Design an enzyme around this catalytic site. Sequence first.
Site, mmCIF file in Angstrom:
data_model
loop_
_atom_site.group_PDB
_atom_site.id
_atom_site.type_symbol
_atom_site.label_atom_id
_atom_site.label_comp_id
_atom_site.label_asym_id
_atom_site.label_seq_id
_atom_site.Cartn_x
_atom_site.Cartn_y
_atom_site.Cartn_z
ATOM 1 N N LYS A 33 -6.677 14.864 5.368
ATOM 2 C CA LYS A 33 -5.895 13.631 5.315
ATOM 3 C C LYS A 33 -4.800 13.620 6.376
ATOM 4 O O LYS A 33 -4.372 14.680 6.847
ATOM 5 C CB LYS A 33 -5.281 13.417 3.921
ATOM 6 N N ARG A 34 -4.356 12.415 6.737
ATOM 7 C CA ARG A 34 -3.268 12.229 7.702
ATOM 8 C C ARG A 34 -2.192 13.307 7.502
ATOM 9 O O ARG A 34 -1.792 13.588 6.381
ATOM 10 C CB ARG A 34 -2.666 10.815 7.579
ATOM 11 N N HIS A 38 0.772 -1.249 0.000
ATOM 12 C CA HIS A 38 0.000 0.000 0.000
ATOM 13 C C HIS A 38 0.793 1.284 0.000
ATOM 14 O O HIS A 38 0.213 2.351 -0.144
ATOM 15 C CB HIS A 38 -0.909 0.034 1.211
ATOM 16 N N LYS A 50 -13.896 9.626 -3.365
ATOM 17 C CA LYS A 50 -15.096 10.044 -2.636
ATOM 18 C C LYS A 50 -15.528 11.423 -3.104
ATOM 19 O O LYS A 50 -16.705 11.652 -3.376
ATOM 20 C CB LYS A 50 -14.832 10.093 -1.124
ATOM 21 N N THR A 69 -7.922 7.307 -1.495
ATOM 22 C CA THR A 69 -9.323 6.999 -1.706
ATOM 23 C C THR A 69 -10.247 8.179 -1.509
ATOM 24 O O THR A 69 -11.355 8.156 -2.019
ATOM 25 C CB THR A 69 -9.785 5.892 -0.756
ATOM 26 N N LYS A 90 2.257 14.644 2.299
ATOM 27 C CA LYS A 90 0.940 14.980 1.762
ATOM 28 C C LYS A 90 0.859 16.490 1.559
ATOM 29 O O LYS A 90 0.052 16.980 0.761
ATOM 30 C CB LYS A 90 -0.171 14.450 2.666
HETATM 31 O O1 LIG Z 1 -3.965 3.753 6.932
HETATM 32 C C1 LIG Z 1 -2.896 4.560 6.475
HETATM 33 C C2 LIG Z 1 -1.544 3.834 6.498
HETATM 34 O O2 LIG Z 1 -1.484 2.951 7.616
HETATM 35 C C3 LIG Z 1 -0.272 2.241 7.805
HETATM 36 O O3 LIG Z 1 0.831 3.092 8.170
HETATM 37 C C4 LIG Z 1 1.076 3.213 9.555
HETATM 38 C C5 LIG Z 1 2.499 2.760 9.815
HETATM 39 O O4 LIG Z 1 2.697 1.427 9.406
HETATM 40 C C6 LIG Z 1 2.756 2.919 11.297
HETATM 41 O O5 LIG Z 1 4.057 2.486 11.592
HETATM 42 C C7 LIG Z 1 2.670 4.381 11.685
HETATM 43 O O6 LIG Z 1 3.863 5.012 11.180
HETATM 44 C C8 LIG Z 1 4.244 6.179 11.889
HETATM 45 C C9 LIG Z 1 5.641 6.024 12.485
HETATM 46 O O7 LIG Z 1 5.646 4.960 13.418
HETATM 47 C C10 LIG Z 1 6.095 7.357 13.101
HETATM 48 O O8 LIG Z 1 7.407 7.287 13.627
HETATM 49 C C11 LIG Z 1 5.998 8.519 12.098
HETATM 50 O O9 LIG Z 1 7.103 8.486 11.147
HETATM 51 C C12 LIG Z 1 7.889 9.679 11.115
HETATM 52 C C13 LIG Z 1 8.916 9.736 12.250
HETATM 53 O O10 LIG Z 1 8.283 9.887 13.505
HETATM 54 C C14 LIG Z 1 9.905 10.898 12.079
HETATM 55 O O11 LIG Z 1 11.028 10.672 12.908
HETATM 56 C C15 LIG Z 1 10.378 11.103 10.635
HETATM 57 O O12 LIG Z 1 11.021 12.361 10.512
HETATM 58 O O13 LIG Z 1 9.290 11.049 9.740
HETATM 59 C C16 LIG Z 1 8.622 9.805 9.776
HETATM 60 C C17 LIG Z 1 7.669 9.710 8.586
HETATM 61 O O14 LIG Z 1 8.333 9.998 7.371
HETATM 62 O O15 LIG Z 1 4.712 8.537 11.486
HETATM 63 C C18 LIG Z 1 4.228 7.339 10.900
HETATM 64 C C19 LIG Z 1 2.814 7.532 10.346
HETATM 65 O O16 LIG Z 1 2.501 8.883 10.110
HETATM 66 O O17 LIG Z 1 1.463 4.978 11.240
HETATM 67 C C20 LIG Z 1 0.961 4.689 9.943
HETATM 68 C C21 LIG Z 1 -0.482 5.182 9.911
HETATM 69 O O18 LIG Z 1 -0.511 6.504 10.400
HETATM 70 C C22 LIG Z 1 0.112 1.483 6.532
HETATM 71 O O19 LIG Z 1 1.403 0.918 6.682
HETATM 72 C C23 LIG Z 1 0.107 2.398 5.307
HETATM 73 O O20 LIG Z 1 0.410 1.652 4.145
HETATM 74 C C24 LIG Z 1 -1.234 3.118 5.177
HETATM 75 O O21 LIG Z 1 -1.174 4.033 4.099
HETATM 76 C C1 LIG Z 2 -11.381 7.983 2.812
HETATM 77 C C2 LIG Z 2 -10.753 8.240 4.125
HETATM 78 C C3 LIG Z 2 -9.285 8.259 4.361
HETATM 79 C C4 LIG Z 2 -8.268 8.038 3.250
HETATM 80 O O1 LIG Z 2 -7.954 9.287 2.576
HETATM 81 P P1 LIG Z 2 -6.636 9.552 1.653
HETATM 82 O O2 LIG Z 2 -7.170 10.435 0.559
HETATM 83 O O3 LIG Z 2 -6.175 8.185 1.169
HETATM 84 O O4 LIG Z 2 -5.654 10.267 2.559
HETATM 85 C C5 LIG Z 2 -8.815 8.520 5.651
HETATM 86 N N1 LIG Z 2 -9.636 8.747 6.687
HETATM 87 C C6 LIG Z 2 -10.983 8.753 6.573
HETATM 88 C C7 LIG Z 2 -11.878 9.020 7.751
HETATM 89 C C8 LIG Z 2 -11.622 8.500 5.282
HETATM 90 O O5 LIG Z 2 -12.974 8.507 5.187
#
Ligand SMILES: OC[C@H]1O[C@H](O[C@H]2[C@H](O)[C@@H](O)[C@@H](O[C@H]3[C@H](O)[C@@H](O)[C@@H](O[C@H]4[C@H](O)[C@@H](O)[C@H](O)O[C@@H]4CO)O[C@@H]3CO)O[C@@H]2CO)[C@H](O)[C@@H](O)[C@@H]1O
Ligand SMILES: *Cc1c(COP(=O)(O)O)cnc(C)c1O
Lengths: 843, 843
Positions: free
Chosen positions: A573-574, A353, A689, A685, A579
């Site tokens: 978005k996150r 993903h 929407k 996604t 992003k």
């Molecule tokens: O549903 C959306 C996505 O979900 C999943 O991703 C998750 C990660 O797998 C999970 O580990 C976590 O990741 C976070 C790191 O743990 C966290 O450290 C940080 O990363 C930063 C870091 O803190 C910082 O030192 C550095 O400068 O930048 C890093 C990022 O470039 O944030 C991470 C997430 O924001 O959270 C994720 C969901 O929030 C799936 O793996 C993914 O495929 C999906 O798209």
């Molecule tokens: C659809 C949806 C997302 C995924 O949005 P991206 O465009 O992939 O960042 C995240 N959170 C919520 C609550 C959603 O409904």
Amino acid sequence: IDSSAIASNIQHHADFTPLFSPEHSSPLKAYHATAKSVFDSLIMNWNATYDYYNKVNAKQAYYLSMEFLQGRALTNAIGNLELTGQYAEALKQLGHNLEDVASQEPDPALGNGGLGRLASCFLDSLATLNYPAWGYGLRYRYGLFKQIITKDGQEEVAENWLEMGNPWEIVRNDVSYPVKFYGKVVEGTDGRKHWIGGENIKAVAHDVPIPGYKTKTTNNLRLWSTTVPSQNFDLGAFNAGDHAKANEAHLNAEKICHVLYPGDESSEGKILRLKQQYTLCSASLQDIISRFESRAGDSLNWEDFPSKVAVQMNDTHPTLCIPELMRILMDIKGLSWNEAWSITERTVAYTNHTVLPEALEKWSLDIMQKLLPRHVEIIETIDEELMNNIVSKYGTADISLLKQKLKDMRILDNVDLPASVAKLFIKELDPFAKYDPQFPRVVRMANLCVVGGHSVNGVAEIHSEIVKQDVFNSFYEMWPTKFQNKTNGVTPRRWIRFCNPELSTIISKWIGSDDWILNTDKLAGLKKFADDEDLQSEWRTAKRNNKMKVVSLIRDKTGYIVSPDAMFDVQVKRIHEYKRQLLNILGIVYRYKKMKEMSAKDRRKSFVPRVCIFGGKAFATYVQAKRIVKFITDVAATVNYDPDIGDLLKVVFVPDYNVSVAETLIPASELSQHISTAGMEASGTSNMKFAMNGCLLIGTLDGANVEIREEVGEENFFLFGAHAPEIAGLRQERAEGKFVPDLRFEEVKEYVRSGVFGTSNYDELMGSLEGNEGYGRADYFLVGKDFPSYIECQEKVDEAYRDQKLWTRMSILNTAGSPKFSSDRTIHEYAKDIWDISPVIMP
Amino acid sequence: IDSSAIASNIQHHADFTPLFSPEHSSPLKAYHATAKSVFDSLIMNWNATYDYYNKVNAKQAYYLSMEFLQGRALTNAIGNLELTGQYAEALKQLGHNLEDVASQEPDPALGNGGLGRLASCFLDSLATLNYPAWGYGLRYRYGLFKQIITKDGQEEVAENWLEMGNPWEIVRNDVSYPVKFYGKVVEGTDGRKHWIGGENIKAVAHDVPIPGYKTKTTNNLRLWSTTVPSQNFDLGAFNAGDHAKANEAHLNAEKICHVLYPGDESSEGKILRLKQQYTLCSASLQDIISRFESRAGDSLNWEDFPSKVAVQMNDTHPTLCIPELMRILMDIKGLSWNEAWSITERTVAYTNHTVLPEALEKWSLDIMQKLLPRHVEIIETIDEELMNNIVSKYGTADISLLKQKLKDMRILDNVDLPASVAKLFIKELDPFAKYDPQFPRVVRMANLCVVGGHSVNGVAEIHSEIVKQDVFNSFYEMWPTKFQNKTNGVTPRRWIRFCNPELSTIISKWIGSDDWILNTDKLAGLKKFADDEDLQSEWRTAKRNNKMKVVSLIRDKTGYIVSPDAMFDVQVKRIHEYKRQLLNILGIVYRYKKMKEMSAKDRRKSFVPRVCIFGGKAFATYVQAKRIVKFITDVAATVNYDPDIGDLLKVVFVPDYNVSVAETLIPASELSQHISTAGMEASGTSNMKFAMNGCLLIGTLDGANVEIREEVGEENFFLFGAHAPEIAGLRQERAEGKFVPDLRFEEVKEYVRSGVFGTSNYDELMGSLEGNEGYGRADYFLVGKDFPSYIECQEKVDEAYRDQKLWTRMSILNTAGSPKFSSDRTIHEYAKDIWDISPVIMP
Ligand SMILES: OC[C@H]1O[C@H](O[C@H]2[C@H](O)[C@@H](O)[C@@H](O[C@H]3[C@H](O)[C@@H](O)[C@@H](O[C@H]4[C@H](O)[C@@H](O)[C@H](O)O[C@@H]4CO)O[C@@H]3CO)O[C@@H]2CO)[C@H](O)[C@@H](O)[C@@H]1O
Ligand SMILES: *Cc1c(COP(=O)(O)O)cnc(C)c1O
Ligand SMILES: OC[C@H]1O[C@H](O[C@H]2[C@H](O)[C@@H](O)[C@@H](O[C@H]3[C@H](O)[C@@H](O)[C@@H](O[C@H]4[C@H](O)[C@@H](O)[C@H](O)O[C@@H]4CO)O[C@@H]3CO)O[C@@H]2CO)[C@H](O)[C@@H](O)[C@@H]1O
Ligand SMILES: OC[C@H]1O[C@H](O[C@H]2[C@H](O)[C@@H](O)[C@@H](O)O[C@@H]2CO)[C@H](O)[C@@H](O)[C@@H]1O
Ligand SMILES: OC[C@H]1O[C@H](O[C@H]2[C@H](O)[C@@H](O)[C@@H](O)O[C@@H]2CO)[C@H](O)[C@@H](O)[C@@H]1O
Ligand SMILES: *Cc1c(COP(=O)(O)O)cnc(C)c1O
């Protein structure tokens, strides 16, 4: 089955499955009752579907994920059962209002981003299309976090969704599986391996029915809650006064299900993260195995396993499924290695993903070896095999070539090669074929997933190419037939029909029926009506009516007062550097500065009135992201209370963005932003929407935008920014001092350092957009680069919004272009090309 | 309302409020469903009763207790609703058996001894007699402990009764009250006291309906579950890896409801013990206050409070009610001291349950001052007042006399006297009127209860005299009109009708109706039939039929095989040096030795065949008690497998003695033992259960035996042992070396040290029966003293059992003598003489 009987069923559940005092009267009380009244229909159908699958013994597909953004079930369950009209009337009789009752439902705290909402959409599509499929996940108590917005920026609060219990689930006390941690392996009488000792917990099933739309088919999301048997509570500890020690065992079992994606900069956070994943895999597989066996009965043959089972590993979290299936098949059923491996290869599939490294999980071997010693044995054997297949398919002759192929595909990195392969590198032994203590011993899960799954797919055409070219190249070369694509989608029942009933009326009117809800291809029939002015009038009014709900939302959640006669410009978005919420706000800051250095007559002439709405959560530990939300909030205060501006511009950050919020926000949106650094977003996604709801997209040639552009047409989409190929080039250009930024971009940066946005000047934040070299600096996500392209692109958006005939024509062509992005066809593709499952319709 | 509809309601709850997979089929699943089907009748009636009390605004009585031995509800609820016949048939249709289904119900882990079962009996009587009364308590998760019997003796396991949830309760989410710990007091603008800061938790109500017998009246046991709002969970802690710290707040709130009577040899165990009690008082009173106010509405006058409220403090645990009511009335409603005190005096009443010092709670002032600083202020004022009333009623003149009266009645012991009273002791100041650091500063709760309650009662005629003479003498002298007696009782619905249906048939036959169940006085009509042989035949057969259920129990729980043609001799009660299980076994050991030194012809001639059944739990930390159960078990192994003995004698220790066990054991019992050291048992209730079932009693002139003897007649009761007056004398006699034991008693002791009872010789246990002086020694409970009296008394029991005409005549006269011991008349007495409440019958 009429509305007057339903109002009695509601009353019944209020009184005969009660959660409150009898004289108490609340909208909340009304919800728990109504929820339960609906639920009765789901139980009937759940059991019908359960029983019928067992009869037919059809191949069942199983979607594993750490995330499920289910959102609120009420209106979607009611809508899917088509009892929407009658539940509405029922609640009037009882002195209540459905919209008001529905709004008391707490969003399950079971997910975070696309990954979770994708999985959830998928379950609705799967049920709707009569496919036999379950979702497996963990039941998180406090979720990721509830976002609050203070004067310090973002603060994280633990979610409370289970405080009164979840009406939408069923505890299955007879469904408990033992899960084991640590321990050690030893060889038994029967030459067979035996994993003994260590810590032992139990995972209990909590079922969440997934009602299909206009179908009796009701599938299931089985959720694991971890615990230990009351007897593991230590009275000696408790009576002695040491109450925490007395409780140690329960805490350790239970914490596994406390938080989603728990912080893992600590060895203890990693072990947990790993225990979370193993539990999901172990509990889920054991249950799958169990169902296979009861359906097979006397005619039991394990060679039938991959023709009756499909397991889908959503990202690398469930990787452990692979060696876990090998453990069970060999240690528990007595299958040989090749027999078990053959079955495993054909049961498992992998979807990647994100090319982002937080998803390309690497684990310390030492931690894994300690926590799951038997699984490492298994991986060791898998990696020995993998290397023998590479030896075959290449070298002995060309060793330096083979050396390269082995680095790339190795599962265990920086380990002593197996005796077999080490042979090829004698000079004596090459340092490459030897563990180097100067570096970590690592387990690369993504490689293991590629090895273990018969299919590997991505989630958009550009992305699945990136996967074959950049990410997994040597693997693609070895097994080109593994690699696929399954472009993401979203369910049009939750994301048009039920989030946007006003538009949904207009849709079924001009197309002549409501079948599009199911056969969403039939939205294409709107293309031809795009220029009819009477359509355009109903279409514009609907958008405006949905915008007044957002004015309420913003008023209530933030306190700001905003007019619905402006352009609603959304980015939700996150919150991630990549992003690029930072790019968006800085573009706003530029227009703000232009407005301030301009006469009030020219302000109207130059800019269209906007309400620029941000939202999303910043991972708590991610320091820079949190500073970005703080910054946005500060700009909001400065802009919204400036009399020179007024209703020409508003900037709002909506707290606690979740499914529920998106359901109000999206239908009301006219412009949405998807402006990620090109080639970093896999799919996305919300894109889909927004387009479904007639929202226009401004964005980069990245992920799903690419295909969304193809569908709605280049002329109905606002494109800007550097493309994917040119990225690493523009960066290395930066590294050797060759990038010189736009004069307007330097202006903005310094206008921020001016301190007009509060007591903070943000030299630290702007600092990440400067220099040529170094972590956290050097503008790695190309904000300053794409800036001029972007703000100029926003001028064309203004000018288009001025001709509301054009804007509405384009609005309509986005809805007409959306049908490709229905999770229904995403499912069909998965079902045919990977899972090889067939629908099953009850009589 | 027929049986065929009920079987549908059962099926419904199995499917539409499910806890298991649908295809799963268990007796346990059948229970949770049947429980819920019955429960529907209780909810209907609960709400009817709730609503009607609010209408009538009748004075409500509130029974507070740390214990409730509710036991299994199923058969008693069904029986009280009189749907017993139809629920039985309903379960046959569904392929189940009520007895088998009922046996799957777990005993609530909500109590321990008489105190708890008394409270529970009381609630059944109160509902049955249409009295408006609730019980308030805490909802203990793991209870006290589940007893297991191993080769090491007793082991304690945490109870699991809530693992699948309690069908017999209702969560009242709208009923939550804040409870506060630590903090500090400060004076506000409005000169009023304000308790701020500290730790804050919330107590949530869990209701347990109490169905009356043949009445719609359904009262309530409201149970407090303590917790904190999810937001108090610390994500910073959790994400950083410190998962216990993240969870600290939840643990502290929740542990309050984890264990009953938690071990308190530690300062941390004391603080908890105290937090348990304060919570019970604080939450309960706030709720009581709340109900008073909503019923009063516009016409609200606090002088009406004691005419609408009665609070009953069961032992000293709820003492804090007193100052807690003062806190609310003053700090929250703004009543003056005397106004609040007047109301408090007339609302609260106190029942003392044992002259034993584990109940005469003393607390460290320093702990209390820290945990509840505002309450100590209040107690300080109460103690200042108390001393001014004593000053009035006595001295200034006679100071040494006054000095004595002040020691005895002082609430705060070893504190500086108030300035007022200190005046009287200048010479300068007398050391007596000064805090002495050489000793603890103590809060004597029993004194505070005497001061605070308008009534003080005991629980048997001998005991309530002990209370006036020995325990609270100076107080009796001051307020003779406070002191009362309310002899205990037991509900004859659970303890005859539903535990012993076989006898219950015989009863209603010869008396001509079943009204005795309610009007239990009408059992007296059996006296005249005592010598009819046809009655005697049915009566003997019933006992024998109930004995075959115990043969099953012992076989299943211990593994021993025992014949029902022997005398069933039972002693089941909390394992305490003072209840003297040790005396009983040593008496058995004497007969065992006599049998072994005797010919097999004479063995039959000399002794009647017995099955001597012990049971009960030993407080875990109580070292000597635990050695006593170990010892009993060792004797069992030695005796039961001796071919010289066979079925002439069996000794069995039934593990995990609880309500459920007693319900099988009691009806099957022919001799029960109540052999406590005279004057140590306050009342005792098993006494009364046994007699009701036609079981004969061997015992001392102690507690309720005294009155039980009066009722059934001296000739139908086996009396032995030193009497209450002679005790302390016989002890001091021992202290000066003047006691010389029986030759047969020395024989037994040394026959134990022989080592015939395993590898343990127990010199340590026998050691507590020796010497003249010293803690834990010196035979303080007069075992060696009463021994000869006792074993000789057991010879008369043998000889009586030989004439089964006599034994059965006596058996019958015990049932005929029991009516006084119905909790119904205990309730009437309480209702008239203390609570001053009237029944309330719905139309
Ligand atoms: O549903 C959306 C996505 O979900 C999943 O991703 C998750 C990660 O797998 C999970 O580990 C976590 O990741 C976070 C790191 O743990 C966290 O450290 C940080 O990363 C930063 C870091 O803190 C910082 O030192 C550095 O400068 O930048 C890093 C990022 O470039 O944030 C991470 C997430 O924001 O959270 C994720 C969901 O929030 C799936 O793996 C993914 O495929 C999906 O798209
Ligand atoms: C659809 C949806 C997302 C995924 O949005 P991206 O465009 O992939 O960042 C995240 N959170 C919520 C609550 C959603 O409904
Ligand atoms: O329902 C029956 C009774 O319940 C209540 O009594 C309970 C006590 O209030 C509670 O404190 C607890 O008491 C136990 C002590 O805490 C424990 O230390 C021990 O006492 C031993 C001591 O360990 C030992 O050092 C010494 O040699 O002997 C002491 C006893 O003499 O055991 C105590 C209980 O066995 O438990 C009680 C319930 O089990 C009510 O207060 C009472 O009135 C009821 O009758
Ligand atoms: O969030 C991820 C992180 O990625 C980038 O890290 C770069 C870094 O610039 C280099 O010094 C080296 O460490 O390469 C990395 C990419 O491979 C960004 O520098 C950083 O801003 C960003 O947060
Ligand atoms: O279980 C209570 C405990 O009470 C007795 O303690 C006596 C003791 O003998 C004296 O030395 C002094 O300490 O007086 C106490 C009674 O006031 C018993 O001695 C002991 O066996 C028993 O366990
Ligand atoms: C009746 C009863 C008691 C009280 O018995 P005593 O004779 O007062 O020791 C204790 N436990 C249970 C389970 C009971 O049923």
